[PDB]
Write a protein that binds this DNA or RNA. Structure first.
Lengths: 206, 112
RNA sequence: CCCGCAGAAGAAGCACCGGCUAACUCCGUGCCAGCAGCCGCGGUAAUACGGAGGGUGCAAGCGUUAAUCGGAAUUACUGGGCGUAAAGCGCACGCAGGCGGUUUGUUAAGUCAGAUGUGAAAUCCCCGGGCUCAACCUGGGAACUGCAUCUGAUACUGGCAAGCUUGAGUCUCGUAGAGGGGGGUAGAAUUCCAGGUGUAGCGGUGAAAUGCGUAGAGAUCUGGAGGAAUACCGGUGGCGAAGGCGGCCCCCUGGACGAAGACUGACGCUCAGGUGCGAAAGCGUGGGGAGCAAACAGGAUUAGAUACCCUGGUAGUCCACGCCGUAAACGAUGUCGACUUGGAGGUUGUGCCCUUGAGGCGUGGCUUCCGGAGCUAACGCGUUAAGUCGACCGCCUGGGGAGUACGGCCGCAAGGUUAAAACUCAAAUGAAUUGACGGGGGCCCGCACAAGCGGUGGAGCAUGUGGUUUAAUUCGAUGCAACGCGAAGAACCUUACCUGGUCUUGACAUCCACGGAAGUUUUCAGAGAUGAGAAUGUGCCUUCGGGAACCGUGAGACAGGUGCUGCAUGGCUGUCGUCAGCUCGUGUUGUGAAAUGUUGGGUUAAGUCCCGCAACGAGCGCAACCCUUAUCCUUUGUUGCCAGCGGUCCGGCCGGGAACUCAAAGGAGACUGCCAGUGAUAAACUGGAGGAAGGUGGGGAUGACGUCAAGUCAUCAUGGCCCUUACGACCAGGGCUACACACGUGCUACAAUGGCGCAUACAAAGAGAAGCGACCUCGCGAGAGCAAGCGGACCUCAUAAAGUGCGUCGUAGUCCGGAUUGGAGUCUGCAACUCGACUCCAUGAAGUCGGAAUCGCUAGUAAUCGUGGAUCAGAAUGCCACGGUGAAUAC
């Protein structure tokens, strides 16, 4: 309730931004919603490709996009034709031509969001949280990751007074600026209320 | 085993001297106490000791996984847990190196 | 009993389903209804209540209540207890009763073996048998745990007889002792009283007063009279059954201990009832009465003070004789006896070696602390046991009721003693662990205090909140941790509220149909919402009977809500607190809750570091790695710079230069690295050196596990529930700015290290396109006209202010202070009334340094001066940033 966004103060030290472009006072706001408009687009449409982050770059007023997702195929379907439908719709609400590049996430169970994602669905469909939670923790642990720390808020288990669980493994040095700590949320708004998930992963070293 | 090697030919100075110094102490610090067991590995077959009290922690431990002990108990200690209670003096030196010297003999034959 | 006929046909329920305890979901109800043996469910998401499905169990039954035993080893013979949980009488002598050392003989009671008779049958049990089986009947056996007698066996127990010495007891001799009773007695003080001296206090308290004293105290000296207590010695010393016992002396008298022998020869151990003793307080009769002192009196303290304090003071305490018989009468440990590893003192006898020199070595009584096996719930006990047994007695059997009532016994009396029940609660206890707390202790820290500096509270003004009024003065935050807060900006808008005017598949979304481009331009009624019109366009693909756009009507699924619930949530936040702590694994200790690690000696800003130590490690934290500020270097030199030189309208204005400032990227540099001392040879602290910076150099970000069911459903998301011709939607005007009040947060003051006028100096950072806006021009000015230039080291905002010099002002409510009001104007914006900002002139209040109480701050800080920014058309003294000047104090 006071810890800074662990992805926050790492911008520039380790973490590069999610948007990379330039502007001025006139259009800066105008750009923000538009790129937020596409973020709003893909986030709704691509649950099933397991998206981790979408990277926006405005080159010479001709937007470029990257989809950080698990299945480079399942976002494009077959022959990749499907993403062409996805390519042009993007530009429209953006305003400039767009080639939509894509990056395949290699350690799927290592990016925070996808991990935090998986937790949501498992938790979203009335499945016991701990049976997945600690299963989830142990997963990337032996796949090789110095530390993992999941945290779930809410009315877990269909409870009636809310509380918070968590879990921790290895190291999660949240004061070391030198570190690499992926981080994401992916809430869970089940039948009973809304429950959250926070995961800290000390995936890197410097 | 890391430090012991690194300090003299290996990894000892890719840092600041005083900082790289700290690992050196740990090497001696590790050498100081744990040094005598480095080679051991696994678990004992026997645990010869000089006293029973001053090392009262041995008997209650060594006679817990059963490792046969051999203790020179003074006329002050308690032999209870010790396997082969050898009456004798702890607090001497010419006597103790005799005991060591006593054990030094046949240990030198055992090797086979 | 047997045979034939008829057809699935005539025949399945009851409890419970939270744990106990077999078996769960849905709906309804909302601390209601109700359930229930227990423990407990019921507050809008109930597996427990009612129904429903389904399930479990039992079954012609099933459950309920009642009753006995069990479970209950909670009446313990089998088979309980008593240091603290319930419970060892207060202690002692001791009759009955129980129990009893060792040797031989005897007896044959107990005991014991065989036999004998009786032990009725059915019933119980065993092999059978009989009704188709069963239940039921039944044959035979066993058994009926027993009682009487005969015959023996004689270990053990008892009787009897005779012993023996260990148990027990007597004598010889000493030793120590606050043992008890009596009768004397000495010193010290206390008060009193009489003299001498001599004089205003004495006594008392946190501070006082009560009281005593100028009829002379208190002080000091001299002396007498009394009463009670025995300093020092005096000691977890001694003595006594226990209560208890203390100056010395004498008389009377009890017990204990040791020696080497003597002698009786089991004379024992315990003991209900009985007898005696038995602190204190108290009772009765009579003596005493210094001090102390219940009660009481007076003075105080307090909110009250039938107390704590102070001055006095009766009983009483003191003595005798009676009485009472209770006490945390407590090592909370019954009496006697046997046995079971040590250590160190103390006290008191006695044997021996050297008393050869305070000694050394034994042997007995009693006693103090710590401790092992073992024991106990643990805590602890531990040769004087709570250990290991044996004898005898007392006593316990949930809490309260109650140690009470009733009766009995005792009592002068107060009372004591023996001692229930109903009724009522499912707990009442014991020891121990983790925290929290303490007007408990130690240690350490923080502008926490102290030492200073300057403010608050007093004044006016700006601003927010409670209160109050209102058509409405939206909503929320409202101990530190709300109160210049959400609000980085309410005239309209914002707007969530108010009056009135209106709309309702709609202002915003998807989906269906037709007329029809979309759009463009314009009038009347109207506050506006709207209503009622009048023209123009006819446009992209052709399936072309349409598209897809976009307007309108029409239909319904829906749409919409800043509606209640932060105690259904997420997300984000404050906070204790940048506090130094919080935990885990593995191992060990403990029955266990847990502990240790994480404590301790030091050390530090720090569970930071070294060492030690049943701990070894680890994670989250602290520190570091990131920003920025301080010194320096390499590249680059613009729109920024100007050193050495040319031209100069001397101004970086112009060549031109590339050094310096500076700008910006990348490196260096501070590490207790060097030196000395101190320090456990450790960490570390102290001072110096060089150095721009010296001990985390300064500042910042970064906020652990958790606490506060702290904020927020109105940023947002969101389960619920909720409304829906409205709690939803659109408009106009108004409120959000109200004002007998009260609080918090600021601004400016009350002036002379200051106000005023003139001359005049030095800043940083930042901001900019329906934007910032020079030059010039007009107006007192606010600003208006024109208007280059700059989306930006180049243009503009923009002129830093306190400072400094010169004149002036004379302690005044003044040239202080500047509110309030008056008129008069400027800009913004549809619109300045409610309710803006600024300017001109006039106007000129309160107020003269602010009660209790109270807050901030450790150096470029406080204080004081001024600048820019965000928010925004317009609107800062609020917030956020910047540079200037420049301290006091920390013992």
């Amino acid at each position: 309730g006071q810890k800074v966004h662990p992805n926050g103060i790492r911008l520039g030290i380790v973490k590069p931004w999610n948007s990379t472009w330039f502007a001025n006072t006139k259009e800066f706001a105008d750009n923000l919603d538009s790129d937020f408009k596409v973020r709003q687009y893909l986030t709704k449409e691509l649950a099933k490709a397991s998206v981790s982050r979408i990277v926006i770059e405005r080159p010479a007023k001709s937007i470029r996009v990257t989809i950080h997702t698990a299945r480079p195929g399942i976002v494009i379907g077959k022959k990749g034709e499907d993403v062409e439908k996805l390519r042009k719709v993007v530009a429209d609400i953006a305003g400039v031509p767009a080639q939509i590049n894509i990056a395949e996430v290699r350690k799927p169970e290592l990016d925070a969001k996808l991990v935090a994602d998986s937790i949501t669905s498992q938790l979203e469909r009335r499945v016991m949280f701990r049976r997945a939670m600690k299963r989830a923790v142990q997963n990337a642990m032996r796949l090789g990751a110095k530390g993992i720390k999941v945290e779930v808020s809410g009315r877990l288990g269909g409870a009636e007074i809310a509380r918070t669980e968590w879990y921790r493994e290895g190291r999660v040095p949240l004061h070391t600026l030198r570190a690499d700590i992926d981080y994401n949320t992916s809430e869970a708004h089940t039948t009973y209320g809304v429950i959250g998930v926070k995961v800290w992963i000390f995936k890197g070293e410097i | 085993k890391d430090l012991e090697t690194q300090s003299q030919d290996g990894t000892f100075d890719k840092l600041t001297k005083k900082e790289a110094l700290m690992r050196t102490r740990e090497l001696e610090k590790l050498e100081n106490s744990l040094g005598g067991i480095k080679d051991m590995g696994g678990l004992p077959d026997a645990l010869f000791v000089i006293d029973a009290d001053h090392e009262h922690i041995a008997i209650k431990e060594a006679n817990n996984l059963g490792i046969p002990v051999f203790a020179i108990v003074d006329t002050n200690s308690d032999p209870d847990g010790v396997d082969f209670v050898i009456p004798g003096n702890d607090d001497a030196i010419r006597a103790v190196t005799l005991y060591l010297g006593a054990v030094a003999a046949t240990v030198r034959e055992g090797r086979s």
